[PDB]
Every structure is written in C-alpha cells, then in structure tokens.
Curated annotation (Swiss-Prot), chain A:
The gene is INTS9. One of its GO terms (biological process) is snRNA processing. This is Integrator complex subunit 9. GO terms for cellular component: cytoplasm; cytosol; INTAC complex; integrator complex; nucleoplasm; nucleus. Although strongly related to RNA-specific endonuclease proteins, it lacks the HXHXDH motif that binds zinc and participates in the catalytic center. Its function as endonuclease is therefore unsure.
Swiss-Prot record, chain B:
Component of the integrator complex, a multiprotein complex that terminates RNA polymerase II (Pol II) transcription in the promoter-proximal region of genes. It comes from the Eukaryota. GO terms for biological process: regulation of transcription elongation by RNA polymerase II; RNA polymerase II transcription initiation surveillance; snRNA processing. This is Integrator complex subunit 4. It comes from Homo sapiens (Human).
C-alpha cells in the first residue's frame, strides 16, 4: 500500500491512499494561511485602510509601492485574498477514484478538485458534514464576493521578490499555486456530485474494498474512516473528541485491530484547558458587560458556537445580564440554527433523550423564544434598526481577514472599553490582529479546542495497538513554542514515520492472502485427508469464476510428495500377486529386482528410479502403485 | 538553457523523493517551455528516467505530456515514448503514466495515419495489461485513435471482461467511435442487451446510451426499436435516479416508434371516468420520483409528441392532471410542453381545470405561462369560449397588473378562431333589443378586454358591424387610435437618405471653407455645431455620428479660440492672470478627446489616429501655455523632452497613415524633428507656436452607424423626501438599477461612484454577475452599494453617479442622483 500526502498542514489534509486496484483519497484542506497574509476586505472602505502607506522595494525596481502596503512597521499584500491549495500534480486526480470526507472543514476545498481537475468518480460524506459544508462554502463565497476587489499582484509572487521580502512573506510557502475563490455553479456542481452515507454503513467498492464511517465526535457528523479488505485494515482517524461533547461519542471498537492507522487532526494548543478557558471567557464577558461596552467574538457557525451559547445561557442566568442582547450575524445563521436543530440522531444520548421528551436538543431555540439572542443575515437593514449598546456580537468569519468581523472592529477600534474575544485556534492571533495595530480594543486570547491532546493520543494508541502509525512531521517534532517539553511529541512503539508536504510513503506491508469462496457441491466432493496431527488437507481441482473482483470456485496438475518404503513395497507386491522379487541393500538405498519385465528399482533418500523394458500395462500398473503409495500435493 | 540548468541541478542534488519532486513541481508550475527546447528537455528527462522512484518517473512522464500539450514535439518524442513503453514495464503507475503520455502525443497535434496513430494503437493492443493496469486507458486510447472507416473483437471481449470500470471505459470508447462514426453493428446490440443486464451501477447508465445509439442507427432485428424501447422502459422503472434521468432524456431523443407500442407504454382511470361523465412506462415514470425525472419525462414527452401527430390526447390528460406537481419548475415545464404540443388539439372538458390553474396566488411566471398557453391553444365550443372569457375576466379583476398579457392573449384567441364568438355578441355586451343602452366606460380594463377580442374576431367575419352599437363605433376609433398593435384595421362605415446627405454636405462645407478668416471660422463652427446638435436630437440612428462630429467641431473651435486669445498679442513676460481660456481650453480639449475615444462604441483606427493627433495638439497647446507662464529653463527643458518623447511614441505606434496625413501638424513636425533635437527649447516653443497657428485642419472620416453609450439610473428615483435612516457606523445597502445602452466591456468599464457629502469619493466595482444582458448591446446593471458614515445632525444628500473608466482615467456619462441619508446615534 502507498500513501501520498499533499498537505503539510497538520489539520487540513489530503491523503491519496493506493490500495489493491483502487485509489481512495481522504479530505480536502483549504489553508487560509495565505488569507492571513493578504490584506483585509472592508465592507465599506475605511479611511485608514484606504491611505495605508505603500512599502517599497529597497532596490526600487519593482512596483511594490502599489503592489504592497505597510502598516505599523509590518507589510501585507494588497489584492483579493488567496487560498493555498494542496499540490494536485503529484498524482492525477482523474486516476484517483473515490473520495472520502471526514468533516466540513475538511471538505472546504472540494470545488477546486472536483471541477477543474477532471476527477469523475464518487465522493462520500455524512449528511451533517455535507450540509454544514454547503453553508460554509456559501458564507465563504459570499464574503469573498459581496464587494469585488478584483486587484491582483504577481511581481510579489515572483520568487526573487519573495526571497527579498521579510518574514512572514519570506516564510510564505508555495505561493505559485495559490488561487482565487470559486463560485456558485462550482459549489452546486460539487454538491450534486456528492453522495450520502450514515454511520456504520458498509459501502462496497467494486468488491475490492469496503468503507465505513465512525463518529469521531469533534463536530456534528465529523467522522473517522475505516477501509478494509478481508485481511487488511486501515483506520484513518482525523479530528476526534473523546471528551463529553454534543455529537455522538467516539467509537474505538471497530477502530482497534488495525494494520495501518493514519492519525491527523490533533489539537493546535495542547496546553489549553477547554472548560477552564470557557469559564474565563464567561468571566471576561461579564466584566466587559458590567463595564458597559461591546464584545466581538468571531466564530464558525457550528460546534464551538453551540457549546459557547449553552455556557453563556447558564452564565447569563447566573449573572443576571438579561438586559444586554446577543446578536449572531452571518448570512448562514438561520439555516445553521435550523440544521443544528433537526440534526438529532447524530447527537449524544442526553440530547437524544431531550428530543424524546418533546423539547429541542439545543437551548438556543429557547433563547430565541426568550428573545435574548437574535440572528441576522447581514448588518445592513433591520439589524441597523435594532442595534444596541452595550452588546454581544458573534460574527461570521474567524480568520478576521474579511467580513462583518472586520467592519465591526474598524468601527470599534478607536474605543478601548470594548473587547474582542478569540475562540477558534486555527490561526495565530498575532498575525490575525497585525493589520489593525495599534488597537485600543482589549484583546483576550482564550482559544477553545476539543481535539484530543497527546496524553489521550498515547492512551488511545495503547488501547488499540496498531501495526503501523502514520503522523505528520510537525507531530513527530517538538513545537517551537515549547521544545523543552517532552509530552508535546507523539510517542509510539514502533515510532511512526513522518511526512512533509507533497511526500510519498510506501507503508510496511506485503499483500499475501485475499478472500475466495468455495461452492457447496465442490466442498461436498472434496475429501480432506491427514498426514499430521491437527492437519488435514485435500488437493483441489476446480474452475475459477471471478465477477467484480470477487472470486469463487466450481468443479469443471498436482505432483508427488513422500518417500515409499521398500519393505511395504515388496510385501504389497507379494500380497497383490507379484512374486520372485529380490531386495539388496546399499549405503543409503535399496535395489529391488522384479523378474517379470526385468524391472530394477533403486530407492534412496528423496530419490526413486524405476528401469524396465518396453512394457506398457505393467508400467501403468507400477505407475498407479507408486503414485498411490504416497500423499498427493 | 533553463532546461539544461534544471537537469544539472537535479543531477547535482539527487535526493530520492525530495529534490526530484521539488524539481518536477517547479518545472511544471513555473511555465511552459514555449520553444523548441521541449525536445531537449524531453531527451534529458528520458536520460534521467533510467533510475529508481517510479513515482518520480510517472511525474516526469506527466511533465513530458504537459510539455507535449504545447504541440512543439511530434515524431521524435513519439519514438522515444514508444521505446520507453517497450522497455519500461514497471507496475501500474508507470504503465498509467505511459498511457497518458501516449494519449497526449496521439491527440496533441498530428491526428494522422502512417505510424502517427496506428503504431500507437498496435502498441496498446500488444501492451494490454493483466489487472487494471492500462486496460481502461488503452481502451480510451483506441477510442481516440480509432483506425479507419473500414477492434470489434477486442472491444467485445472487453465488454465481458472483469472490471466494471474497464467496461465503462470501453463504453466511453464506444461513444467516441460513434461520434467519429465507425458504423457499429447488430452484434453490438446483442452484447449491449447483455450489458444492460449487468447487475451493477453506471455500467447500465452508459450501456443504455449505447443501446439507444444502435437502435437509432438502424431498426432491423426481427422489431428492433420497439424491443429497445421496451428495454428502455423496463430500465426506467429502475430505482437509480441518475439512470432514470439518463433514460428519460435518451428515450426522448428517440423519435420514431410503433404508435401502438407507444399507447401500450401509456396504458394502465379517472380520466376516462370523467370523460364518460362528460359524455406502464410513463404512468410510473412521471409520478415515480421527484423533479429531475419529472422534467426529463416531460421533455421526452414533448419531443415525441411533436414527432407523433397522434397520441397527444392521452398525454393531454396526463399533463392537465399533472399541473399541480408542487415543484414550480415542473409546473412551468408542464405548461411549456402543453404549448409546444397544442396543435390539432381540443380541450372540450379540460378547460375548467386548466383555467382553475390560471387562477393562482402570485406565481407571476405561472400565470404568464398560462396566458401564453391560452393564446396558443385551440378550443371547439362556444360555451368553452364563454367560460374562458368569464374566468379570464376573473383573473383580470383579481390581479390588475398583467392586463397587457390578458389583452394580447384575447387578441390571439380572436385571431385564431373568429367564428366561435358570433352568438355571444348580443350577450357579452349588453345591447337590450329596443332600449338605448347606457354608454360603456371607455378605459375600463374589462370592457377593453372584451372589445379587443371582438375586433380580432371581426377581422375576418363581416357580419357584425350591423350588430355593433354607436358607442362600439367610436370605441373602435379610440382603440385603433390608442392600442395600435392590439386591434387590427377594419372596414367600419365610420372609419374608412436626406439626413445622411445633409450631414455629409455640411461637413464637406466646413472642410472646404477652412481657408478663411479666424473670425469667420468661429461663426461657421458655432453654426454647424448647433446644427448637428439639432440633427442629433432630430433623428435617432444618426444621433451618435452627429454628436461625434459635433463634439469634434467643438474641439476644433475650442483650439482656434485658444489660439486667437489676446495673450499672444500681449508681450511674453507679463502673463497676468485669469486670461487662461487657453489653459481651460487645453483641459477641456484633452477631456473631450478622451471622451471621444472611449465613450463611443464604433471607432476604427483611422478615427483613433485622428484622435491621437488631436491629443498631441492639445499637449502642444498646454506646453505653449506653460512655456508662457514658466520662468525655469530646466522645467521648460523637461516639458520639451517629455513632449518630444510623446511625439516619438506617436510616430512609433502609428508608423502607418503618415501618407494619409497630408500637410499635417504632426507629419510636418516629424519632418522638422531633428532641428528640434538640436535647438534650445525657447525657439522650439516659438516655432511650435507659429507651426500650430498655421498648421492644418484634418478630415474626420465618418464611419457607419455607431452609437454613444448612455447610462440612466432608473432606481433609486431620488425624488423621495423620506430619508433613509440608520444607526451610526452601521451600513445601509442601497440597490442601484441602471440601464446601459451601447457599451463594450461593461463589467470592466462601468463603475459606480458615490460622493459622500463630507466630500469623499468611493469607487464601487460591480461583480460581473450584476450585468444582465437581455438583448443585443443593451445591458442592465443591478447591484448593491454599501453606504456608511458617522452620525449626522440632519438628513443629507449623497450623490450616486456612473463613471466609465478606461485603460487610466474616468469619464462621467450619467445623470447624478441624490439620495437622502441620515444616521442616528446609538440608542443606549
């Protein structure tokens, strides 16, 4: 089996696995690291971002004064934001056959692969995954749109200028394959190419393989995959959460007893205590509200938002802050709430029982009923009619480089009393908040993570004991933040081979057996026979019939094994009718003479030889005799 | 060069996966070779291929195919690829890469015989793999390199071989062979039946396309097309909906069939129960699954119903009951197919529910489609006409907006069949047999709706002017006066290129009368300017060319006034102030030349080089004025250098048309150019001054019927004193709806400009989905403009205008609109 890893990102993978006669690729990363590097897109053009000064080449040859701009001693690129792609040219994705999805964050990059490249096979994902993915791509395409900034620069994308530029523009990787954003017809094309699957569903591919998804528990419908043939097992685990969360809990029973385990989607901040930082969030939120300002929280419309609103529901009941309202602003807000509402069977047992006792599983429907939390699609209109101060706003995009988030903190940047709270760990908040610096806004960084830490990784691997482990180089290596700490690296016996962006591995396995079926009449015909205690064997003579890579045998040249004894030979010749047979002995063999047809036979250790005259019927009699005095293989 | 350096770098590095993948990715992603060095790069790649890492070898083969996609190489690369395929039997990845390279070489450029495709086909046939290695790829190789119009044995075996993927690839090759022709046979029909029975997905989906194509090839088995059609229907009842959509579209593409077999498909009913009261293919395929197979079914039905003159009634009922299909796409497609089949068609009972259909909530598309259906339909009975009228009047009095479509469909009804309405004429309009009936209302829409039907009926039959009353006489006069395209001409007793030549004559008058006094030139120019402006108002198709020549004459008059300014009479060192009508003239003349270049639609390079001549003349006049006002000899030197540089740019760009310019400013200056290189700028501008004073006037060749662009904002109206209210810092979205007329490159040229009353301009670009194109050269811009600012004390007026940018500068060509904006402060 062979593995091609097309993403150096630890969280956003593309893994092309070649097994037997099929090709199965997993996940789709759309790295917004280049998005972090590009300039933000104001919904309404702010004067300061309009007149940001232009950083200049020290040589002065290139037109980087208008290709690039500078702010607070730091430099950014001025265009529409780009997105980093996985390297598609390592393997022809047309020859790549079947695509699996873990979760919506891992399906963000799907129209790129599914429209332009020429892939034409089938794609699998669960229902909540595919629906929340459609909502996310709708939000993303809207925000790259809704104001077209068609400017694009390329002389900075020249390699020499990239070398001359300072970090992190010096630290930019694979600038050449960065692309502009995709559109609704592309979205609909991929989302019609999709097919559906539930948990523990066995999907057969060509008889060659069978795939099953299991609840990882990180997100609503987030799923680890299991690919098996009848002797071979690959467990692909990406982004599980074994803590008590809202989705279905993680299921390791089918995960164990695996030949090859690939592990991705681990935590980004290992030292983060989730519930503790959630409590710190609530305390800081109460402090800002009591001070009388406005709080911003950028968040994806799944997962962490639901957990945050539940805890804020309990905390607002605790602190008695029913005066200050909550506004959830995103063009996907209404459909996100409704989809989280009806997706019930994918939840955990507490929420399923909540469904079974006629109430909605999430409390934010009751929050809407009590009118504390109001959802709004865009900031223009009735939201502008109903805005309040002091206030709470959960805004659409967490990467901060486009949307209602950037407009709101352009509005609120001058004030100090207001507060921004980061809640998603997928980006460095320093490089996120660099363009607005200097900033009077209070910034409190309390990231929320549910991906399993290395202690739980060690526990899970010691529970399941796979034969081979595959993990990223960033998980093998110590982090630059705390290289002194030892528990921050994955430990496994045997040590897992690593991989880098666009790398090829050949996994340590050799294909030996596969699954074939016998047919009952042929099994009736076959009679086993025993040469060794506990070993009974039978020679076979059949016709193979193989349709759709599944194999069966039906009735329509074996050789010998075993030495023949001379004493039993002559005894059975005498009792069969042969007479006047004389035996002489040698150093290792016996020479036996039969006077009829003048037959001389020498018997040695793994050596027998019969010499006679031109005779036929005696020869074939001796043929059947010597062949029936041995075991057939 | 670069390829040799890359090969040397790869050989020097020689890392196993790392440098190989990095070099391959860099060479692929950087650029195409775009030269003949692709062969040398391929030779270096073939030399480096004799190594390990078959994955890197496959990547190199893909890079070779990508390089061959530029069609630089042919036979040498073909021979090298043949050698590599013969000597490189190393597993599935390298086999697939070789197959892909072979396909790229075959389909890249040659497309010829004589070992350009036949040798590759023989090589693929000999190198067919053992287990999924090349089989699919070599099948599509032979598909795209089909030999001649003389492979059938091997494709027959590859139909019955192991893998469904290989089967589907063979079937795709069959698509390719049929679209190249190749005249398939009936053994393909038999094996296509046994491929229809294949127990597996998508193999069926493409194999049934093959059974369709052989059936439409020829109908000779025993009945071949009827057997194929029955197989198609028994395949339509499969569960797989993609298969069903494919099935329905392909059976609709089928056009000839046994008629009795078609009614056997429609055979099973409350339709015939209702018919007596008045007096399984499609019947599962319509209400089997949702709107995909439903739309495919109705398109199939419309195509074969347009084919068959019979058969329509047994789908007439199956459409009239399947209006209310709870999917509006299915609704609209049902109405459209009823229109397209509505010929030799009676609706003796179905009028009631098909008009309960046009009674409908909002559904503006549905109601319009039903009006089209009623205008293009036929009816048989006078009672049906009567009830069609009464519920049509129900519709008009219930939704008084689509009365225009109501009147036009009543018109088409009267024109379609006039004789049905004749007994209703006393009844539909009250004409009490001896009384003086009171005069009906004139502009009452119901009465208009009945009158237009009456007149369209009376087009042919003459036996009802006597039936008319006197109010009907004067109302026919008024309706014929008003709605010219709705009522026709009748026989009632009461109602029984000079412009182009003139434009040419005036222009040649100016051109001939060029050689006279500057004053008389001024009055002649003014007179002809207002003349051509009057003509541009007067006509429409000459308006663009008239305004274009008019603004050119305005240009010339402006320059002549700038020359005749008294600044030249007054001595040089003074240049007092405010007499710089010359400078204002220079700015206006430059702006008019830009406008004259870009805002107009049809311009050709003769006009363009005339424009650039005039722009050079403008820059010369501006240079003269700045020379008059400027004391610095080095600023004079700089301006002179830049001006002569631009003259050099002009002549370099327009090498041509120098014979076309006779006695021209620019060509005489090009003759005197080296002396300008020698001489000091003072005498340069002196000679330039006199030179342009008695330079010339060029002719402007008038082109064909060109137009000038015109932008009109129809929304927002801007007369509203009700302000648009919001809270401070928040944004309000304001829709902009404008009509653009005669604009090229609209999504890149038309940009919105908003002036905020604190004085700042915000330039908003529209996304290219906002430019709808309903017709030829006439576009609609529908967009959002996002307005925000801090709070204001009162309402103010924000300006919205449409700017046109070129490539460099912007030109307004729209009337500005004022929108009242008022932001409130925060509520708490």
């Amino acid at each position: 089996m062979k593995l091609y890893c097309l993403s150096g990102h630890p969280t956003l993978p593309c893994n092309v696995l070649k097994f037997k006669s099929t090709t199965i690729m997993l996940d789709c990363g759309l790295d917004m690291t280049s998005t972090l590097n590009f300039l933000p897109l104001p919904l309404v053009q702010s004067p300061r971002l309009s007149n940001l000064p232009g950083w200049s080449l020290k040589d002065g040859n290139a037109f980087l004064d208008k290709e690039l701009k500078e702010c607070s001693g730091h430099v950014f690129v001025d265009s529409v934001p780009e997105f980093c792609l996985p390297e598609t040219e390592l393997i022809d994705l047309s020859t790549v056959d079947v695509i699996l999805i873990s979760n919506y964050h891992c399906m963000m990059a799907l129209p790129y692969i599914t429209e332009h490249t020429g892939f034409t096979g089938t794609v699998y994902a669960t229902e909540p995954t595919v629906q929340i993915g459609r909502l996310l791509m709708e939000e993303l395409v809207n925000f790259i749109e809704r104001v077209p900034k068609a400017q694009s620069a390329s002389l900075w994308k020249n390699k020499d200028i990239q070398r001359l530029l300072p970090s992190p523009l010096k630290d930019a990787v694979e600038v050449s394959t960065w692309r502009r954003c995709y559109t609704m017809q592309e979205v609909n094309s991929a989302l019609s190419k999709i097919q559906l699957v539930g948990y523990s569903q066995k999907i057969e591919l060509f008889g060659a393989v069978q795939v099953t998804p299991l609840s990882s528990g990180y997100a609503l419908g987030s799923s680890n995959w299991i690919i098996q043939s009848h002797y071979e097992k690959v467990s692909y685990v990406s982004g599980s959460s074994l803590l008590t969360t809202h989705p279905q809990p993680m299921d390791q029973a089918s995960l164990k007893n695996s030949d090859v385990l690939v592990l991705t989607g681990l935590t980004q901040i290992p030292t983060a205590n989730p519930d503790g930082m959630v409590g710190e969030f609530c305390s800081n939120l109460a402090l800002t509200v009591r001070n009388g300002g406005n709080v911003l929280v950028p968040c994806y419309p799944s997962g962490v938002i639901y957990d945050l609103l539940e805890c804020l529901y309990q905390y607002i009941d605790s602190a008695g802050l029913s005066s200050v309202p909550l506004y959830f602003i995103s063009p996907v807000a209404n459909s996100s709430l409704e989809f989280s509402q009806i997706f019930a069977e994918w939840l955990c047992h507490n929420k399923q029982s909540k469904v079974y006792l006629p109430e909605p599983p999430f409390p934010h429907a009751e929050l809407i009923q009590t009118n504390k939390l109001k959802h709004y699609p865009s900031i223009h209109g009735d939201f502008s009619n109903d805005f309040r101060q002091p206030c709470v706003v959960f805004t659409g995009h967490p990467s901060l480089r486009f949307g209602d988030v950037v407009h709101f903190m352009e509005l609120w940047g001058k004030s100090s009393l207001n507060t921004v709270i980061f809640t998603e760990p997928d980006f460095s908040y320093l490089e996120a908040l660099a363009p607005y610096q200097p900033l009077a806004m209070k910034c409190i960084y309390c990231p929320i993570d549910t991906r399993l830490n290395f202690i739980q990784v060690s526990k899970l691997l010691k529970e399941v004991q796979p034969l081979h482990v595959v993990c990223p180089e960033q998980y093998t290596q110590p982090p630059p933040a705390q290289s002194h700490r030892m528990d921050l690296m994955i430990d496994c016996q045997p040590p897992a081979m690593s991989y880098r962006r666009a790398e090829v591995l050949a996994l340590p396995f050799k294909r030996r057996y596969e699954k074939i079926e016998i047919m009952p009449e042929l099994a009736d015909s076959l009679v086993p026979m025993e040469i060794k205690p506990g070993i009974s064997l039978a020679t076979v003579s059949a016709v193979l019939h193989t349709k759709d890579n599944k194999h069966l045998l039906q009735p329509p040249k074996p050789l010998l094994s075993g030495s023949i004894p001379v004493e039993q030979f002559v005894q059975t010749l005498e009792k069969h009718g042969f007479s006047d047979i004389k035996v002489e002995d040698t150093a290792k063999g016996h020479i036996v003479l039969l006077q009829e047809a003048e037959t001389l036979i020498q018997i040695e250790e793994d050596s027998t030889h019969i010499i006679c005259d031109n005779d036929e019927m005696l020869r074939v009699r001796l043929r059947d005799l010597v062949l029936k005095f041995l075991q057939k293989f | 060069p670069s390829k040799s350096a890359a090969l040397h770098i790869d050989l020097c590095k020689a890392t196993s996966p790392a440098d190989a993948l990095q070099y391959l990715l860099q060479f692929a992603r950087k650029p195409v070779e775009a030269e003949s060095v692709e062969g040398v790069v391929r030779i270096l790649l073939e030399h480096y291929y004799k190594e390990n890492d078959p994955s890197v070898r496959l990547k190199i083969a893909s890079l070779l195919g990508l390089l061959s996609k530029t069609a630089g190489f042919s036979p040498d690369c073909i021979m090298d690829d043949a050698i590599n395929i013969l000597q490189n039997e190393k597993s599935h990845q390298v086999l697939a890469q070789l197959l892909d390279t072979l396909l790229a070489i075959g389909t890249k450029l040659p497309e010829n015989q004589a070992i350009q495709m036949r040798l590759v086909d023989v090589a693929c046939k000999h190198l067919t793999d053992t287990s999924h290695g090349v089989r699919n790829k070599c099948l599509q190789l032979l598909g795209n390199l089909g030999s001649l119009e003389k492979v059938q044995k091997i494709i027959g075996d590859y139909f019955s071989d192991q893998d469904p993927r290989v089967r589907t690839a063979a079937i795709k090759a069959m698509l390719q062979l049929h679209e190249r022709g190749l005249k398939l046979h009936q053994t393909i029909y038999n094996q296509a039946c046994k491929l229809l029975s294949d127990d597996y997905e998508q193999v069926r989906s493409a194999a049934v396309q093959l059974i369709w194509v052989v059936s439409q090839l020829y109908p000779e088995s025993i009945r071949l097309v009827d057997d194929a059609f029955g197989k198609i229907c028994h395949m339509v009842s499969d569960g797989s909906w993609v298969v069903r959509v494919q099935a329905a579209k392909l059976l609709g593409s089928m056009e000839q069939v046994s008629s009795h077999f078609l009614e056997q498909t429609l055979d099973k009913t409350a339709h015939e129960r209702a018919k007596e009261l008045y007096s399984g293919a499609f019947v599962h395929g319509l209400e089997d699954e949702m709107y995909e197979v439903r739309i495919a079914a109705v398109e199939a039905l419309c195509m074969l119903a347009q084919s068959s003159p019979s058969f329509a009634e047994k789908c007439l009922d199956f459409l009239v009951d399947m209006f209310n299909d709870e999917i509006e796409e299915v609704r609209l497609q049902s109405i459209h197919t009823m229109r397209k089949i509505s010929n030799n068609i009676t609706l003796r009972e179905d009028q009631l529910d098909t008009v309960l259909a046009v009674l409908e909530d909002s559904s503006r598309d549905i109601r319009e489609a039903l009006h089209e259906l009623l205008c293009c339909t036929n009816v048989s009975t006078k009672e049906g006409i009567h009830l069609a009228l009464v519920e049509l009047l129900k519709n008009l009095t219930k939704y008084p907006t689509d009365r225009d479509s109501i009147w036009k469909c009543l018109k088409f009804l009267g024109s379609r069949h006039p004789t049905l309405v004749l007994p209703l004429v006393p009844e539909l309009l009250s004409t009490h047999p001896f009384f003086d009936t009171a005069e009906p209302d004139m502009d009452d829409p119901a009465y208009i709706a009945v009158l237009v039907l009456i007149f369209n009926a009376a087009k042919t039959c003459p036996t009802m002017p006597a039936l008319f009353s006197d109010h009907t006489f004067r109302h026919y006069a008024y309706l014929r006066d008003s709605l010219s395209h709705l009522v026709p001409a009748l026989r009632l007793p009461g109602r029984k290129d000079p412009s182009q030549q003139f434009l040419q004559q005036s222009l040649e008058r100016v051109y001939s009368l060029q050689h006279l006094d500057p004053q008389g030139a001024q009055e002649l120019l003014e007179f002809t300017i207002r003349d051509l402006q009057r003509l541009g108002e007067l006509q429409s198709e000459l308006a663009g060319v008239a305004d274009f020549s008019a603004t050119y004459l305005r240009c010339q008059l402006l320059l002549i006034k700038a020359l005749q300014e008294k600044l030249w009479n007054v001595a040089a060192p003074l240049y007092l102030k405010q007499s710089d009508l010359a400078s204002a003239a220079a700015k206006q003349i430059m702006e008019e030349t830009y406008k004259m270049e870009f805002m107009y639609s049809g311009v050709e390079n003769k006009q363009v080089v005339i424009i650039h001549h005039m722009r050079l003349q403008a820059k010369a006049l501006q240079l003269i004025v700045t020379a008059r006002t400027t004391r610095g000899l080095d600023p004079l030197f700089g301006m002179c250098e830049k001006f002569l540089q631009e003259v050099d740019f002009f002549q370099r760009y327009f090498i041509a048309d120098l014979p076309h310019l006779q006695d021209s400013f620019v060509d005489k200056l090009l003759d005197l150019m080296p002396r300008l290189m020698t001489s000091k700028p003072a005498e340069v501008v002196k000679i330039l001054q006199t030179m342009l004073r008695q330079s010339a006037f060029l002719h402007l060749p008038l082109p064909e019927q060109i137009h000038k662009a015109s932008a009109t904002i129809i929304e927002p109206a801007g007369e509203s004193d009700n302000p648009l209210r919001f809270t401070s810092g928040l944004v309000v979205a304001l829709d902009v709806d404008a009509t653009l007329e005669h604009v090229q490159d609209p999504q890149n040229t038309v940009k919105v400009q908003v002036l905020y009353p604190d004085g700042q301009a915000q330039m908003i670009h529209p996304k290219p989905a906002d430019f709808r194109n309903p017709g030829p050269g006439r576009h609609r811009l529908i967009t959002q403009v996002y307005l925000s600012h801090t709070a204001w004390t009162e309402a103010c007026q924000v300006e919205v205008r449409l700017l046109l940018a070129y490539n460099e500068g912007t030109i307004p060509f729209s009337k500005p609109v004022k929108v009242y904006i008022m932001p409130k402060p925060a509520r708490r």
